[PDB]
């Protein structure tokens, strides 16, 4: 079924960091400040789908951002949402840069990746 | 095990600049933000600014952004807290502590022993 | 930034009484306290950590509850060794901010 099954499990993905992105940039946080303070690593190269383990070994840090971005109006669930991503990344499935980036760079570089190997699919 | 060593005791006149430094061994020096925290004689204690030596990014509480300046030596495992324009009301022991855990704020459970400044003629 | 109203600044207390200190914050930190003691020419030691953890090694008499902008901190029975100053510190946003502190002596 992979000819539809790859294409999903990366929607599913793009879905899940596209849903934590827009609770982070649509609602006022009082622990922002704090939020933005997480150093998350970068992979020098992610183009083809092995790169996802650089999103593996980053995970651990992610979660507990996720802690953080509950609030009256944005809920999730750090524990499950981890999950599914870890789950994807290891079905679907490293050097860093020297330069740090915050959960939004993250974020935004992950989905654009994932954007640019869903556009391959179609 | 993790241990973090401040410098000693310094005397400096009112307007020179001072700079404190804090070894830190045990744990990797380069995942955890380092925060200072000022306390002036018979007070209490004062949240100055916070490094994360993997890169030098740093952050401070307003008033002090220019009289604090935070670095750090990776390879040394050292911070360094440069105080400038030195006044009377800087006269204080400034403590180096590490947030409890990696890549983020938290509180501070690692503490160096505290060093004393005076700034006096 | 958040500041925090440590109360009372003073108490002194017999043995084996229990002991209250609050915290009050000016805005909602979410459970984001935590609670130092400080004995003189020591550095500050962390007793309870966000989510009222207390760490590794501290005595079990010391508890704390709290959610949302009023917090307690507790000392079950009053031993001597617990003469010192407790700060409470917020580490929910930045600037990270203190509560002024509470001297606690012993009565005899």
């Known amino acids: 079924s992979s000819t539809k099954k790859t294409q999903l499990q990366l929607e599913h993905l793009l879905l899940d960091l596209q849903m934590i992105l827009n609770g982070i940039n649509n609602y006022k946080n009082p622990k922002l400040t704090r939020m933005l303070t997480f150093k998350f690593y970068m992979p020098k190269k992610a183009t083809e789908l092995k790169h996802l383990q650089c999103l593996e070994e980053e995970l651990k840090p992610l979660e507990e951002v996720l802690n953080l971005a509950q609030s009256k109006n944005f809920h999730l669930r750090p524990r499950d949402l981890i999950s599914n991503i870890n789950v994807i990344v290891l079905e679907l499935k490293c050097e860093y840069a020297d330069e740090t980036a915050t959960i939004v760079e993250f974020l935004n570089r992950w989905i654009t990746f994932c954007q640019s190997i869903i556009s391959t699919l179609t | 095990e993790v241990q973090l060593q401040q410098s000693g005791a310094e005397l400096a006149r009112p307007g020179a600049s001072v700079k404190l430094s804090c070894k830190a061994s045990g744990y990797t020096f380069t995942t955890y933000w380092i925060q200072w925290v000022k306390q002036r004689p018979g007070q209490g204690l004062e949240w100055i600014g916070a490094i994360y030596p993997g890169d030098g990014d740093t952050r401070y509480i307003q008033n002090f952004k220019g009289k604090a300046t935070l670095t750090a030596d990776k390879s040394s495992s050292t911070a360094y807290m440069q105080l400038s324009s030195l006044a009377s009301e800087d006269s204080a022991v400034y403590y180096c502590?590490?947030?409890?855990?990696?890549?983020?704020?938290?509180?501070?459970?690692?503490w160096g022993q505290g060093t004393s400044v005076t700034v006096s003629s | 930034d958040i500041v925090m109203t440590q109360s009372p600044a003073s108490l002194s207390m017999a043995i084996g009484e229990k002991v209250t200190i609050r915290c009050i914050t000016s805005?909602?930190?979410?459970?984001?306290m935590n609670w130092y003691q400080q004995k003189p020419g020591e550095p500050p030691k962390l007793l309870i950590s966000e989510g009222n953890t207390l760490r590794p090694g501290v005595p079990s008499r010391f508890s704390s509850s709290g959610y949302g902008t009023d917090f307690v901190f507790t000392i079950e029975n009053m031993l001597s060794e617990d003469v010192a100053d407790y700060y409470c510190?917020?580490?929910?946003?930045?600037?990270?901010?203190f509560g002024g502190g509470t001297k606690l002596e012993i009565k005899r």
């Open positions: 805005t909602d930190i979410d459970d984001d």
């Open positions: 502590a590490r947030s409890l855990a990696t890549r983020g704020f938290y509180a501070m459970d690692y």
């Open positions: 510190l917020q580490s929910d946003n930045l600037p990270y901010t």
